Design a protein around this ligand. Structure first.
Ligand SMILES: Cc1cc(N(C)[C@H]2C[C@@H](O)C2)nc(C)n1
Ligand SMILES: Cc1cc(N(C)[C@H]2C[C@@H](O)C2)nc(C)n1
Length: 460
């Protein structure tokens, strides 16, 4: 039985509005409704992994697991295995996988982050799951961010607290947050970003939605505009939105948006908005293709509609050679020429690099770089030809070209990372000097860049 080089992943997000679901929710898992929908000819084909995020979920874990597993069994005739389930208040994540994957999945991790302080600590935050699927690390985050049209900055703050403090994936990757720990990271939820148009334009917005004319609405979507200004979700992707706003509906129909201010809303308007979203970030030059992104039309218990997204995701096998794991493979090496970091810091300490990768027996510290001043004020840290030669555990190009090197630039004075990035070994050539580049981030904000050349030797 061959190991897969691709899997498909279902991501669902649904703010259930504290109400039990209706008796049939299969349209969600089938990616049917509005937007980019799944072909009918695939309806009996199970996805490999289903990841379900709920918010305002009134059900017990047991109650929701029974509904999810029975739904999938009805669709696919497969009894899925529960990989993980984690709940913070009424925010929940469930991971289900086909039984054939049970012995491909390991290192399962769950965590949560509570956002806000005093007043604002008590119902918002995130839950997440990570695991290995054969040689590939997968992370999943379900967040319920701060509500309200005039709180986009709070949402952005909630995002940074979540990516700083959610403790998923390999703890040995200590300089790295969740935005660097996984081959594929999916972040979804009721992100709560709104269409920022004047309240007086509510009926105009509704008209546009009825005409399926979303362009003048999406140009005011706060998540797209905050992302375009690099205020949130730097380096994450989102499929184009081609479905109507998923909030705020009258319950038991989808014929009406309920936008007007009410005591129950704190006297706030809820103009129709794309609150419910799926984004991803995958390492450079790994296969990831969104094959559906939409909302259901026939699940009406909540004031939100469920959102679905599906992905093809490249995966790798758990590689064993005669040499590594358990030793190095002398026919392999990774070399670095003409390398330098450009940092935005106003500080003057020495810096060194750390290289982390599951192709190395353990992480590698460089010598300190040489600081110079950039012609536009920057700190440039020069490594020239001084970086260590990295010794991979396996030299076989079918393994090594699929790997990635995480880079942290660290202060000599404090050993704190000032920037983190990732370099793919999926090169155009081996034994050839080739340009490399990554942006550097810290707490998910841009802090600099790392560029230079690489020379990769494999056994071929
Ligand atoms: C908790 C945890 C650990 C982990 N490790 C150690 C990987 C096994 C592979 O050899 C590196 N990976 C993930 C995704 N999570
Ligand atoms: C090259 C590139 C561009 C980009 N853009 C323009 C986002 C659309 C959102 O409005 C800003 N996002 C990413 C992740 N990469």
């Amino acid at each position: 039985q061959p190991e897969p080089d691709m899997i498909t992943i279902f991501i669902g997000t649904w703010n259930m509005g504290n109400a039990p679901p209706p008796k049939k929710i299969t349209s969600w898992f089938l990616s049917k409704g509005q937007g980019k929908t799944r072909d009918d000819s695939a309806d009996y084909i199970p996805h490999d992994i289903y990841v379900i995020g709920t918010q305002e979920d009134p059900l017990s874990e047991k109650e929701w697991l029974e509904i999810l597993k029975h739904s999938l069994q009805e669709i696919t005739s497969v009894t899925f295995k529960t990989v993980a389930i984690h709940t913070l208040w009424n925010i929940r994540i469930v991971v289900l996988a086909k039984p054939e994957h049970e012995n491909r999945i390991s290192h399962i991790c769950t965590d949560n982050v509570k956002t806000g302080i005093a007043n604002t600590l008590g119902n918002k935050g995130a839950v997440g799951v990570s695991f290995m699927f054969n040689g590939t690390s997968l992370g999943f985050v379900n967040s319920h961010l701060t509500s309200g049209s005039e709180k986009k900055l709070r949402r952005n703050q909630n995002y940074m607290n979540i990516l700083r403090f959610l403790a998923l994936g390999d703890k040995k990757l200590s300089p790295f947050n969740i935005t660097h720990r996984f081959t594929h990271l999916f972040w979804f939820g009721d992100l709560n970003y709104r269409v920022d148009l004047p309240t007086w334009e509510a009926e105009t917005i509704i008209q546009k939605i009825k005409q399926q004319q979303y362009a003048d609405l999406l140009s005011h979507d706060q998540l797209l505009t905050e992302r375009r200004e690099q205020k949130v979700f730097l380096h994450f992707e989102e499929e184009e939105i081609t479905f109507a706003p998923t909030y705020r509906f009258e319950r038991l129909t989808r014929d009406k948006y309920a936008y007007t201010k009410q005591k129950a809303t704190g006297m706030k308007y809820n103009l129709p908005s794309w609150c419910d979203r799926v984004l991803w970030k995958s390492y450079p030059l790994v296969h990831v293709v969104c094959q559906s992104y939409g909302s259901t039309s026939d699940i009406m218990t909540s004031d939100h509609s469920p959102v679905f997204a599906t992905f093809e995701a490249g995966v790798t096998s758990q590689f064993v050679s005669k040499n590594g794991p358990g030793t190095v493979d002398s026919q392999g090496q990774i070399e670095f020429l003409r390398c330098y970091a450009t940092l935005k810091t106003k500080s003057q300490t020495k810096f060194y690099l750390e290289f982390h990768s599951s192709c190395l027996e353990s992480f590698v510290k460089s010598q300190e770089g040489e600081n110079e001043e950039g012609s536009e004020g920057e700190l440039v840290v020069k490594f020239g030809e001084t970086l260590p030669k990295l010794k991979p555990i396996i030299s076989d190009p079918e393994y090594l070209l699929d790997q990635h090197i995480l880079i942290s630039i660290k202060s000599s004075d404090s050993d704190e990372s000032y920037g983190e990035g990732c370099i793919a070994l999926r090169l155009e050539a081996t034994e050839t000097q080739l340009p490399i580049y990554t942006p550097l981030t810290h707490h998910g904000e841009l802090t600099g860049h790392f560029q230079g050349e690489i020379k990769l030797q494999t056994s071929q």
